[PDB]
Curated annotation (Swiss-Prot):
It is found in: Nucleus; Chromosome. It comes from Homo sapiens (Human). The chain holds residues 172 to 831 of 852 of the full protein. One of its GO terms (biological process) is epigenetic regulation of gene expression. Histone demethylase that can demethylate both 'Lys-4' (H3K4me) and 'Lys-9' (H3K9me) of histone H3, thereby acting as a coactivator or a corepressor, depending on the context. Acts by oxidizing the substrate by FAD to generate the corresponding imine that is subsequently hydrolyzed. Acts as a corepressor by mediating demethylation of H3K4me, a specific tag for epigenetic transcriptional activation. Demethylates both mono- (H3K4me1) and di-methylated (H3K4me2) H3K4me. May play a role in the repression of neuronal genes. Keywords: Acetylation, Chromatin regulator, Chromosome, Coiled coil, Cushing syndrome, Developmental protein, Disease variant, FAD, Flavoprotein, Isopeptide bond, Nucleus, Oxidoreductase, Phosphoprotein, Repressor, Transcription, Transcription regulation, Ubl conjugation. One of its GO terms (cellular component) is protein-containing complex. This is Lysine-specific histone demethylase 1A. Belongs to the flavin monoamine oxidase family. One of its GO terms (molecular function) is nuclear androgen receptor binding. Induction: Down-regulated during neural differentiation in neuroblastoma cancer.
């Protein structure tokens, strides 16, 4: 599975041609299947050669010399496959030693707005393709939403921190190229209630199980029964979850009522059987030849005692049924008050991963990209994720503290206007043939706008911008000079007191003596209005309740993100809002033409299968580089 592995690691089926390939190789698709098999092998083998050694450029010549007979004889097919893989960034992407040209002459000028991972990835491709490219970045650093805090021996990521599995992840290649150290995240996450006591194992698993059944029930309601619209409004995941919970509570109350009726019935029978027994005793009373009269009262009294003694047995078969029934009552409630708070911790955790309250997520599409998840454990970046954007910036023409304010594009070229953010007096004007916009969705949604488009973007584009969600989440970095927590535990949770505030500092994690506290959901935007000192104080109180007031010292350093207030972000990353879908991600990727595409788009919000991630941003950049090169360089 070597060549089979290369296709998989490249997100491609090893045994068939993708739609994109069919388009580029119409003669292969509509030809001898035997040729397709040769195409797929050359493609898979070329990807393998690249994947086995991504720190060095894989040339056409070298691909040909390493292919085996007969493949090494079809020079022309190999060239076409290598050119295709290269143009689209499946090989020779990221950071690697070139071993050939980098023509001193440059064809075409492209301006790239934003120097985040998508802009950086696209730039390296475009430059290696021989175009003249310049990146305009508003901040005084590269990386965008990859933002690493570094002081002394302290390292912590305020932006992206997790590599979500290596299997199929292009970040696996990049990780090798920049030598970024990755470490698995242990899953064990003990939970502590608001009073500091740990949630027992049995309870933990019970609630988690319900969390899972609840989500599965909404998935069933949505994709099997199609209940995605109600009162002419798209249903949200949070809305559906609350209804499923209501049904559970109704069911519990129903079974409770039936059990009470069983009790009351049994009680009524006992009461009645008792009354007839009392009346029979009274009959036995009254009832209480001479020789014959004796035998006669005998058969009479014994007939009434064959009646009464028996009545006492059917009575014992009732007092038995009763006492059982009320020893085996059904559940009193679906979720106890505490149980619900623990369930809210799992919802808070989901709001964290999705960067938004559950009531804003599309029930039908929120998890639209699951089928593309990578395989493998999730890893964290020991030395800080900024090592990637920093290494990708090597050798590019990047203009920092340069905030773009207007993008003008015509059938003859474009102009990008920006201003120095250190001296808002001077305004630069950069002319070019094409503009690649990597501005965050949050910035594109800004009202009044942060950057004007002349002409204004089409309605089909802006309405997509408006429908799509742009979430938020924050982190508080607590640097200590000591480790007072369990070092064999990477994560531990804090169960809040209310549903509304379930996302407040609900999670803590480590890996130096550093703890990060996470703020999710509704709490994420609200907490940004609290000073660092006060938020830090709330963290310590929580930690003190867990570990003990004397075990928790004051932090040496703290850093608090406020992604929604950050003007260059306006949030953390997108999410499929109620009323949107995977299609808006495609609409966001569509280039704008004045009869030749001039304005292009990349960014995590323009890639349908991998949104809201660093790998998605990277792939979107590789994608646009290819589309732009195809237009200008042929
Ligand atoms: C808190 C947080 C946690 C996250 N965790 C993870 C994670 O664990 N794993 C994962 O894979 N992803 C994670 N993500 C998402 C991931 O970081 C992003 O999807 C990705 O980095 C986006 O890259 P981008 O190039 O699309 O956008 P950006 O990185 O935002 O790049 C856009 C650039 O445009 C610049 N800019 C803005 N306005 C202007 C202007 N007017 N003129 C010029 N420049 C401008 C911005 O400064 C920025 O540099 C997280 C994001 C956040 C914020």
């Amino acid at each position: 599975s070597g060549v089979e592995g290369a296709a998989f690691q490249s997100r491609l089926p090893h045994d068939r041609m993708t739609s994109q390939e069919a388009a580029c190789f119409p003669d292969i698709i509509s030809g001898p299947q035997q040729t397709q098999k040769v195409f797929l092998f050359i493609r898979n083998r070329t990807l393998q050669l690249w994947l086995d050694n991504p720190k060095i450029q894989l040339t056409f010549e070298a691909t040909l010399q390493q292919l085996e007979a007969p493949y090494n004889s079809d020079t022309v097919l190999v060239h076409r496959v290598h050119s295709y893989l290269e143009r689209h960034g499946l090989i020779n992407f990221g950071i690697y030693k070139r071993i050939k040209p980098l023509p001193t002459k440059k064809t075409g000028k492209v301006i790239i707005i934003g120097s985040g991972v998508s802009g950086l990835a696209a730039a390296r491709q475009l430059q290696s393709f021989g175009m003249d490219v310049t990146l305009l970045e508003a901040r005084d650093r590269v990386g965008g939403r990859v933002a690493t805090f570094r002081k002394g021996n302290y390292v912590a990521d305020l932006g992206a921190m997790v590599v979500t599995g290596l299997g199929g992840n292009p970040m696996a290649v990049v990780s090798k190229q920049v030598n970024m150290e990755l470490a698995k995240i242990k899953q064990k996450c003990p939970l502590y209630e608001a009073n500091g006591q740990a949630v027992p194992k049995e309870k933990d698993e019970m609630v988690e199980q319900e969390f899972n059944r609840l989500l599965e029930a909404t998935s069933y309601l949505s994709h099997q029964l199609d209940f995605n619209v109600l009162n002419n409004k798209p249903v949200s995941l949070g809305q559906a979850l609350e209804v499923v919970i209501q049904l559970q509570e109704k069911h519990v109350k129903d079974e409770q009522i039936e059990h009470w009726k069983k009790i009351v019935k049994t009680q009524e029978e006992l009461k009645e059987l008792l009354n007839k027994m009392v009346n029979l005793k009274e009959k036995i009373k009254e009832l209480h030849t001479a020789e014959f009269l004796v035998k006669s009262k005998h058969r009479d009294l014994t007939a009434l005692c064959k009646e009464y003694d028996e009545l006492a047995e059917t009575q014992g078969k009732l007092e038995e049924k009763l006492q059982e029934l009320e020893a085996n009552p059904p559940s009193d409630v679906y979720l106890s008050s505490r149980d619900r708070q623990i369930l809210d911790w799992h919802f808070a955790n989901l709001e964290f991963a999705n960067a938004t309250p559950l009531s804003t997520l599309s029930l039908k599409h929120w998890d639209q990209d699951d089928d593309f998840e990578f395989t493998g454990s999730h890893l964290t970046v020991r030395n800080g994720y900024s090592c990637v954007p920093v290494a990708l910036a090597e050798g590019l023409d990047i203009k920092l503290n340069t905030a773009v304010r207007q993008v003008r594009y015509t059938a003859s070229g474009c102009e990008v206007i920006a201003v120095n953010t250190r001296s808002t007096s001077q305004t630069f004007i950069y002319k070019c043939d094409a503009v690649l916009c990597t501005l965050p969705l949050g910035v594109l949604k800004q009202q009044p706008p942060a950057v004007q488009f002349v002409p204004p973007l089409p309605e089909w584009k802006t309405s997509a911008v408006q429908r799509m969600g742009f979430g938020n989440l924050n982190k508080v970095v607590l640097c200590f000079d000591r480790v007072f927590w369990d070092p064999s535990v990477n994560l531990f949770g804090h169960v809040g007191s209310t549903t509304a505030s379930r996302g407040e500092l609900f999670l803590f994690w480590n890996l130096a003596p550093i703890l990060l506290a996470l703020v999710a959901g509704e709490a994420a935007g609200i907490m940004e209005n609290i000073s660092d000192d006060v938020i830090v104080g709330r963290c310590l109180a929580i930690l003190k309740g867990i570990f003990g007031s004397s075990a928790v010292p004051q932090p040496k350093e703290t850093v608090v993100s406020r992604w929604r207030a950050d003007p260059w972000a306006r949030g953390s990353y997108s999410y499929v809002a109620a009323g949107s879908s995977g299609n808006d991600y495609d609409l966001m990727a569509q280039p704008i033409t004045p009869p030749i595409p001039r304005l292009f788009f990349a960014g995590e919000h323009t890639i349908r299968n991998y949104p809201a991630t660093v790998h998605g941003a990277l792939l979107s950049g590789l994608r646009e580089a290819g589309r732009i090169a195809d237009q200008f360089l042929g």
